[PDB]
Write a protein that binds this ligand. Structure first.
Ligand SMILES: CCCCC[C@H](O)/C=C/[C@@H]1[C@@H](C/C=C/CCCC(=O)O)[C@H]2CO[C@@H]1C2
Length: 1218
């Protein structure tokens, strides 16, 4: 993939003409990783990594030689000054041009000030001055992008070298240091702390060009307007701390919202996750109240933050007006006079020096500080203790053999007992050494010591040969299965097929689409644990080293495949291979040529399996211990009257902005056309101050009103969302995952909270300033309207031709960035496996090949934006050239003031036009959040919570529940679930449910609570369920869910969220479940704040809490589901006895997985694959041997079935015959 940047001219690299081909492909189809362009030879990650590592090693060597701390900053400066000084040389020219061109503006205006149509020499000099002006703008517009590319490329280069060295160091970290750090702290300086280098360079040169330009402009101002300049200049300096006091008060109102936004998101997580429980309990009004309170206390801080942001942006808007106003007020008050040249040169000087002082220099300070902090972090990460490179091997005679003598070691220098105590044993080729020991013996530490991963404290380890190692936890990296097995080794067909067959991988390969070529991501998300272990064993076999270490390989696989692996691979293939095995299955010890027992870190005994049979020590003994979106976004915030007022306020602000400078123009014209006589100063200063004040107030009003309207618009959208999701049926929650629903209320809501109203108040600001500039240039020279139409239309087409490729390349630099982090993560978790093989240098090449794929999409993202900016500045330069020259070919009609106004505004169009375009792109990027928010504000809705026909208060009177021909389906068009359900439930009876998992046992609750409006009829005391709203049907039925959940809050709430009960009632209810005492030893009585799902509570305790809830509701209907999954037997029988003897007179339906729970129930649904077949007393069903109840009783066993039948008979005989 050749790069046209390498074969291009200078005239082609200034206009980025080498990039036209790609754009043409980008206009037709979508862009992939093949349409991409490769990188320069001087940009491959390996090259920069090697160079900067060389300089860093030299610097640390000199630090050792001179006994002071080494600094990475010095290495960076040493490696980059020779190539960073060039950029500085050019930015000096750029700032010099930005300071020079006002003077030639002044010379043109001065030619207009002394107009004489006959003096053609002055006309020619003015044409020359205009030509120099266009040269300045064409070196500020066309040569500033082949500069900005290289300024961003220096940062790209620095970051790529940094990432390469970080990975290189993290590949050889010592376990002493690797344990004190984490694997999240080794990705959080390669994903968030190495990105600063991509930005600091962009502004680095402004730490010396900022002040220099601020002195040059000040000197020019003094030369032209004199001491009064300081006055205005003073105001500009005031903008430096004032900008850093809207930041130490914005960051106190922005980090005081997280303590509310995160609370709101966490409550939303608990609401969305357990929505079945909330709906069944009919509690969602309580969570609605809680989220309303949190969202209101979050909108308060968002409203202060947005008001402050709006005031800051209006200060940015009106700062130039204030500077010019105070400057010329002082200039006139000290006794001088206004002419149209000194005014409109000083204006451009103030514009340039303001754009430098208030915008670029603080950003450079911030970014240099962030880059210095990041450099300090990467300094700390590169001084961690390394691993001793495997040193000079003692001269052997060619005998590949492992011998250990008197080995002692510690994982920590603080541990009292050493991990190993004087181990002195060896192994020879062909001898399958094995280790027997319970967990905690040190067998893993033993293999680590064999690998050298554990530092020897005493003794010696002699390992001479290639080492093949298998970790206890199988480790798979990002790649195909064949590549996973090869692990860099070249493929050999017969050597790859024997591995496959001996590892029994054929089944797994035939299960997947690509056979053995299926791509396996990180953590084995596409594989199973057995597959991971088998692929790791395949890697170990195919690497075919001299020495093999296997730590618990067969534990996680089935018996047959494990036996096959041990026999035909470990016993057969490795019978000629040095092998050390750690095992937990005793069956495989018979084939071990040796056995070592390790305990308390000490050798217990080595010998053959026969000798341990003779020792009398049984092993078990040892092993046991569009446009519509914008309209909907703007309609929500305010009615259209306020929107029309907003438009009028924008127009008034911009018009007053323009008219202040127009007033300076008019003042100059009225002064030149004079005569001693004077000019009435009070009037002129009065209207000039009035225009300045109008500009300031209208800017502030516009900013606050736009922020208020869009914040209100977001507040309304969020409220509509939330109150439209609390009413969505559970089917919607089944279709969409939690993450997608728990992200459109934290990510999407957060984008329209304090992101959307900024790029939308900035975009309007700069769009109206551009329109003001264009309208001034058209009102001064109307003929400009003719050429300016071929500069609108072209622009429009341009903005398409770019946005059909930028959006196709700002996803490539995102979908090819994650592989770097993925490989870094996958290489640290299997790091021992990587370093066990000598091929650690080969993973460096894989990292580079994953980094020469993101430094190849940052290339296109850095050059396509420049191909757009060159043409935008060509359009703006055509505009300024036409304004500067066409004001001279028409010199007979214009005057000094009009020319000054038009030409100075055309000069300030630069950069402003680009920022307008950039914010337009960002708004069109961030309206997707509004689109998603408005997609959820129009979701499905279940039947309303209230109906006209409210039920009688006594209902249910008894509990009679009649299922009449109930046909229920989870989703429309899906499989029938309950089909002609016809049953009767008489008050107070106990009806168990039997069936298969998913055969309709858990759908009766789904249909009886109308979680999905059923077809058929259900009568609760002769009242149709579908004829009453949900909260008059669910409030009168209690339930015990499968997995109890406690909602974050006081224990008062998880029982009485509506405050409808009193402390004595709650205490009594908790006493009935005997957990009363268990609570009155907590910090609070009931007001103990809890964790997620009551993490300080047990599953049985949670079931007790729900049982207490059911007791508190004291309604005459009740449903139990999955009583005790794996709860301890004491709590099991406790719950069971409470289920009977508290709820004797409360009609009970029970859906249980077992029989003892429901053996004594009065009756039983028998559900046959979604069909009710048998329903009577359990003893009657046991009388008929053909009943499914009889069959599933007998399936348990003989004694169990006999006891169950005896219990049923006892119940029958005690009940029906008194
Ligand atoms: C994407 C290209 C942007 C061009 C930047 C241009 O040279 C800026 C000039 C001023 C802009 C302020 C820029 C903001 C700083 C950019 C830094 C950042 O966004 O991280 C807007 C306020 O008046 C004009 C437009």
């Amino acid at each position: 993939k050749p790069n046209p940047l390498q074969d291009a001219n200078l005239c082609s690299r200034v206009f980025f003409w080498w990039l036209n081909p790609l754009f043409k492909i980008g206009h037709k189809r979508r862009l992939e990783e093949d349409d991409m362009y490769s990188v320069l030879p001087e940009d491959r990650s390996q090259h920069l990594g090697e160079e900067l590592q060389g300089f860093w090693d030299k610097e640390v060597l000199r630090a050792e030689n001179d006994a002071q701390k080494p600094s990475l900053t010095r290495a960076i400066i040493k490696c980059y000054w020779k190539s960073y000084l060039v950029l500085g040389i050019f930015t000096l020219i750029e700032e010099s041009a930005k300071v020079i061109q006002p003077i030639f503006l002044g010379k043109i205006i001065n030619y207009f000030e002394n107009y004489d149509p006959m003096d053609s020499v002055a006309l020619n000099t003015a044409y020359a001055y205009a030509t120099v002006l266009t040269f300045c703008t064409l070196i500020l517009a066309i040569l500033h992008h082949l500069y900005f590319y290289h300024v961003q490329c220096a940062g790209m280069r620095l970051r790529v070298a940094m990432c390469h060295m970080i990975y290189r160091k993290a590949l050889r970290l010592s376990n002493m240091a690797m344990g004190k750090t984490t694997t999240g702290q080794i990705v959080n300086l390669l994903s968030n702390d190495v990105n600063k280098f991509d930005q600091v360079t962009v502004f680095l040169h402004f730490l010396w060009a900022g002040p220099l330009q601020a002195i040059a402009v000040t000197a020019l101002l003094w030369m032209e307007i004199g001491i009064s300049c300081l006055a205005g200049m003073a105001v500009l300096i005031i903008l430096l701390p004032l900008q850093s006091c809207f930041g130490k008060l914005f960051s106190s109102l922005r980090s005081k919202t997280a303590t509310f936004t995160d609370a709101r998101i966490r409550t939303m997580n608990e609401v969305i996750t357990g929505i079945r429980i909330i709906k069944m309990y009919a509690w969602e009004k309580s969570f609605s109240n809680l989220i309303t309170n949190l969202r209101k206390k979050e909108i308060s801080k968002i409203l202060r933050s947005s008001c402050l942001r709006g005031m800051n942006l209006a200060s940015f808007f009106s700062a130039s007006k204030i500077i010019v106003f105070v400057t010329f007020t002082t200039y006139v008050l000290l006794g001088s006079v206004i002419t149209a040249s000194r005014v409109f040169v000083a204006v451009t000087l103030y514009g340039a020096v303001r754009l430098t002082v208030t915008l670029f220099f603080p950003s450079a300070i911030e970014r240099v500080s962030e880059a210095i902090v990041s450099i300090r972090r990467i300094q700390t990460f590169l001084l961690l203790d390394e691993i001793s490179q495997r040193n000079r091997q003692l001269p052997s005679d060619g005998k590949k053999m492992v011998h250990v003598q008197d080995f002692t070691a510690f994982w920590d220098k603080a541990s009292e007992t050493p991990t190993l105590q004087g181990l002195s044993f060896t192994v020879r080729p062909g001898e399958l050494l094995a280790v027997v020991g319970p967990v905690g013996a040190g067998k893993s530490s033993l293999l680590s010591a064999v690998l050298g991963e554990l530092a020897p404290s005493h003794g010696l380890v002699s390992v001479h040969g290639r080492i093949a190692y298998v970790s206890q936890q199988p480790w798979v990296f990002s790649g195909t299965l064949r590549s996973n097995i090869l692990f860099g080794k070249k493929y050999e067909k017969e050597r790859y097929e024997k591995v496959i067959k001996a590892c029994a991988l054929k089944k797994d390969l035939q299960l997947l689409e690509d056979g053995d070529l299926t791509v396996i991501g990180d953590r084995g998300t596409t594989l199973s644990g057995g597959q991971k272990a088998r692929v790791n064993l395949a890697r170990a076999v195919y690497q075919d080293a001299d020495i093999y270490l296997l730590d618990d390989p067969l534990s996680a696989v089935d018996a047959e495949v494990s036996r096959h692996l041990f026999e035909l691979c470990i016993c057969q293939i490795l019978h000629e291979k040095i092998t050390i095995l750690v095992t937990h299955q005793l069956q495989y010890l018979k084939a071990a040529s040796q056995i070592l027992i390790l305990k308390d870190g000490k050798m217990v005994q080595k010998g053959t399996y026969t000798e341990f049979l003779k020792s009398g020590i049984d092993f078990g003994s040892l092993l046991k211990k569009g446009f519509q979106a914008y309209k909907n976004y703007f309609r929500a915030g305010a009615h259209w009257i306020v929107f029309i007022f907003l438009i009028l306020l924008n127009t008034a602000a911009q018009v007053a902005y323009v008219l202040q400078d127009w007033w300076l123009s008019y003042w100059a014209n009225k002064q030149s056309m004079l005569n001693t006589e004077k000019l009435d100063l009070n009037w002129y200063l009065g209207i000039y101050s009035g225009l300045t004040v109008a500009t300031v107030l209208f800017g502030i009003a516009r900013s606050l009103l736009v922020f208020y309207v869009l914040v209100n618009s977001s507040q309304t959208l969020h409220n509509k969302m939330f109150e439209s999701i609390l009413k969505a049926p559970v089917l919607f929650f089944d279709r969409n995952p939690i993450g997608r629903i728990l992200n459109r209320f934290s990510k999407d809501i957060g984008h329209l909270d304090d992101l959307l109203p900024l790029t939308f108040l900035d975009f309007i600001q700069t769009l109206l300033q551009v329109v003001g500039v264009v309208s001034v240039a058209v009102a001064v020279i109307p003929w400009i309207a003719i050429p300016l139409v071929p500069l609108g239309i072209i622009f429009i087409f341009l903005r398409r031709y770019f946005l059909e490729t930028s959006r196709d390349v700002k996803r490539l630099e995102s979908t090819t960035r994650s592989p770097v982090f993925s490989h870094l993560s996958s290489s640290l978790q299997g790091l021992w496996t990587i370093r066990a093989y000598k091929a650690e240098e080969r993973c460096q090449e894989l990292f580079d090949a994953h980094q020469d794929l993101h430094s190849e999409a940052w290339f296109l993202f850095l050059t396509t934006s420049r191909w757009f900016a060159v043409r935008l500045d060509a359009i703006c330069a055509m505009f300024v050239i036409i304004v500067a020259f066409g004001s001279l070919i028409l010199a007979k009609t214009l005057d000094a003031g009009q020319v000054g106004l038009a030409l100075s505004y055309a000069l300030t169009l630069m950069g402003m036009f680009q920022w307008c375009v950039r914010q337009s792109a960002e708004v069109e990027n961030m309206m997707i959040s509004v689109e998603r928010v408005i997609e959820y504000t129009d979701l499905e809705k279940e039947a309303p919570w209230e109906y006209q026909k409210r039920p009688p208060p006594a209902w249910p009177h008894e509990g009679v529940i009649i299922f009449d021909n109930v046909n229920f389906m989870y989703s429309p068009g899906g499989p029938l679930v309950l089909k002609h359900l016809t049953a009767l439930i008489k008050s107070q009876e106990k009806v168990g449910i039997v069936g298969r998992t998913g055969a309709g046992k858990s759908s009766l609750i789904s249909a009886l609570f109308r979680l999905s409006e059923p077809e058929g009829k259900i009568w609760i005391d002769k009242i149709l369920t579908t004829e009453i709203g949900l909260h008059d049907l669910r409030k009168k039925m209690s339930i015990i869910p499968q997995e109890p959940v406690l909602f974050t809050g006081t224990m008062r709430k998880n029982l009485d969220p509506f405050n409808e009960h009193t402390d004595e009632e709650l205490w009594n209810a908790l006493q009935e479940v005997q957990l009363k005492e268990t609570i009155e030893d907590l910090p609070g009585k009931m007001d103990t704040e809890l964790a997620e799902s009551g993490s300080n509570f047990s599953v049985g305790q949670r079931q007790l809490v729900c049982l207490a809830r059911a007791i508190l509701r004291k309604n005459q209907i009740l449903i139990i589901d999955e009583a005790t999954a794996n709860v301890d037997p004491r709590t099991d029988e406790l719950i069971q006895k409470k289920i009977r003897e508290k709820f004797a007179h409360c009609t009970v339906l029970t859906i249980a997985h077992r029989l003892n729970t429901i053996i004594d129930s009065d009756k039983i649904m028998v559900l046959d694959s979604g069909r009710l077949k048998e329903y009577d007393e359990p003893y009657v069903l046991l009388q008929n041997k053909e009943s499914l109840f009889y069959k599933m009783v007998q399936q348990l066993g003989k004694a169990e079935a006999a006891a169950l039948t005896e219990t049923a008979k006892q119940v029958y005989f005690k009940r029906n015959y008194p």
